């Protein structure tokens, strides 16, 4: 209820009150993989291919971004988020005045070339990067020579000079001087003078000097960027100020690809290619890696990786965040081709309810036109994919996959027992001409069918969601709230109005409001519920009669 | 239910939910015998005597 | 009620209801209370387009 | 001084109007930026201006 005025006043008045109450999830996934681009231990939010390619160059993990979007033509691209295992670092060279430091990490960065030349005509320095892998050549002109003065009095001479506080390296005074004594000053260091556009327009109401802006730009630099300067002549010939590493920063601050920072005199150098990228060695562990998606949002996450140590960890980290209070749940699957035998033993490893395990692996057909053989985790990212794309509570069952052959086409007999040892097996069918692939369960590697929140993920997601918004929601609503004799009643009218919503999206079947019952007492308020969740169709019985009918006339 | 665009995009626009439902045996016979032609092991369909 | 009425022949607010506009007073004070729908700028339209099948005779 | 423009169209839209979607009447702009851009800005609370590409008659 904000009020109106917010400053009281004790004479005559009209005040409002105004109460603007009343007219006031997405499922992120998640990948982790090797890459040619972005940063180490980062997480980007992607939402288009051209976004990835231009952050990841190549590599496993820009194929699983692809085939995440693909495997859901129908559905709606939601966000992905994606991280880099390795350790790369950036491409820099230490030559001339200028530290020079490459964006982009790993080898890819080493082919970056930097060369600086100095224009003998202007008296302005000229730097060039080129970068054959994106056929990225541009040349800035032109830099410093952000302004000049001017002196037309009749006096013998003119003259200024530029002072640096001696600690930070900083202008801070900017003199005119006429003849011996001073004429006036300005003070760089700071208010008035903050930016050097305010000094040009001073410089040009005085009478006899005058001063024009570059005309290469509108650069705008801070009068403390400006260069050491002193004693040079003014009437003889207009004097450039150069301030020659502020004007790079402005050009290569958030653009183009190369960094620069200030070690020094920094003059022109040859072009020479940077040095120092490496990608690394291999991360030993990648418990580091996942603690950065903590409180990103996502609720799947596909390791691109078949050994099993990472996939331990990564079972590790969801059932961590559940307990925290973010519910996150694991899609893995096991190198080339393997058998029912070493799909049992990574299944009785784990044995997570948060953790569903991958069997087939086949051939992706990929937007280059690449039929790329791929191993079984890869296919996790289309089941990862088009899980997140479905709505809350559906399920990846009897599903299309979109794939163009799998290395092993499992009998009738062998699906039974990959799905009673709680192993996601796709199947060809081949009971219709236009033969296609599907899913035939979600079923995750805890094989106890009597718990089915732990055992479907369908049913354990919608758990997760319902338990998880509820816990938002009611923390930010009631918690600091006064306990007024209508607590309870709109505690109850506020879970019934949430319940309905459910019930309208369909991510419950129904609830009886009847039995929505709150106590409160003092801090505690005890809420009691009854929800009818909501079920994914697994067994279909049809008991056919024949019976016998008598026809007449 | 196909949405458009299937790009979600946060600023002011309109979206379109797209509905294409409401609107979407042969008992094949088999013969085994023999033969001089055609590979060993495989099914052909037959659809004319020209084609046998 | 004019003043709402106004406001409602401007377009610069949706609708009220006039039933809920309740004044008490008592002494200096005044107590008004009024309901108003506040009018809003369109910024999401939602289309669900469904295709069925028609049969023709004749 | 774009804003002045918003600021000058907002004055003379009536109470309660919005300038989403309205005109703007620039030549140019120095960054035409693109459909996940623009999303970025609206999400961090910034307006931004979008040249219209879907159309002949570009505004």
Known sequence: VEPFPRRPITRPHASIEVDT?????????????????????????????????????????????????????????GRILAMRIEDAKPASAEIGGLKITSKIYGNVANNIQVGLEKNTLSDSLRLRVIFQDDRFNEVYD???????????????????????????????????????????????????????????????????????????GDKNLESSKLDKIENANIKDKAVYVKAVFGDLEKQTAYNGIVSFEQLKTIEPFELTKLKGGTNGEPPATWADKLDKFAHEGGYYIVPLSSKQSVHAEVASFVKERSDAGEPMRAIVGGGFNESKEQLFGRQASLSNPRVSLV???????????????????????????????????????????????????????????????????????????????????????????????????????????????????????????????????????????????????????????????????????????????????????????????????
């Open 142 to 216: 032109n830099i410093g020579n952000i302004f000049t003065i001017k002196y037309k009095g009749e006096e013998a001479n003119a003259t200024f000079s530029v002072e640096h506080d001696e600690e930070t390296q900083k202008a801070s005074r900017l003199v005119l001087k006429v003849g011996d004594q001073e004429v006036k000053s300005y003070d760089l260091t700071g208010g008035a003078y903050d930016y050097t556009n305010a000094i040009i327009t001073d410089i040009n109401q005085l009478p006899d000097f005058e001063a024009k802006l570059s005309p290469f």
């Open 21 to 77: 109450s009343g007219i006031g999830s997405e499922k992120v996934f998640c990948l982790i993989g090797q890459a040619e681009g972005g940063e180490p231990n980062t997480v980007y939010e992607l939402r288009n291919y051209s976004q990835a390619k231009r952050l990841f160059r190549s590599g496993e993990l820009l194929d699983a971004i692809e085939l995440a979007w693909g495997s859901n033509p129908n559905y709606t691209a």
């Open 359 to 553: 069997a087939n692996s086949g051939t992706f057909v990929m937007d280059d036109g690449r039929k790329n053989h791929v191993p079984a985790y890869m296919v996790a990212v289309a089941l990862g994919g088009l899980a997140s794309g479905l709505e809350i509570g559906e399920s990846i069952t009897f599903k299309p996959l979109r794939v163009s052959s799998l290395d092993q086409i499992y009998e009738s007999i062998d699906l039974d027992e990959l799905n009673e040892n709680g192993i996601i097996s796709i199947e060809f069918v081949r009971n219709r001409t236009n033969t296609f692939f599907r899913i035939v369960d979600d079923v995750t590697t805890f094989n106890d069918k009597s718990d089915p929140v732990k055992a479907e993920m369908a049913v354990g997601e919608a758990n997760d969601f319902l338990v998880s918004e509820l816990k938002v929601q009611l923390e930010d609503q009631f918690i600091g709230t006064r306990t007024i004799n209508t607590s309870a009643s709109i505690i109850k009218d506020f879970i019934q109005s949430y319940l309905g919503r459910k019930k309208r999206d369909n991510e419950i079947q129904d609830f009886p409001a009847e039995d929505v019952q709150v106590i409160v007492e003092g801090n505690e308020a005890r809420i009691s519920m009854t929800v009818y969740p909501i079920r994914s169709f697994k067994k279909i019985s049809v008991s056919l009669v024949y019976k016998q009918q008598t026809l007449q006339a």
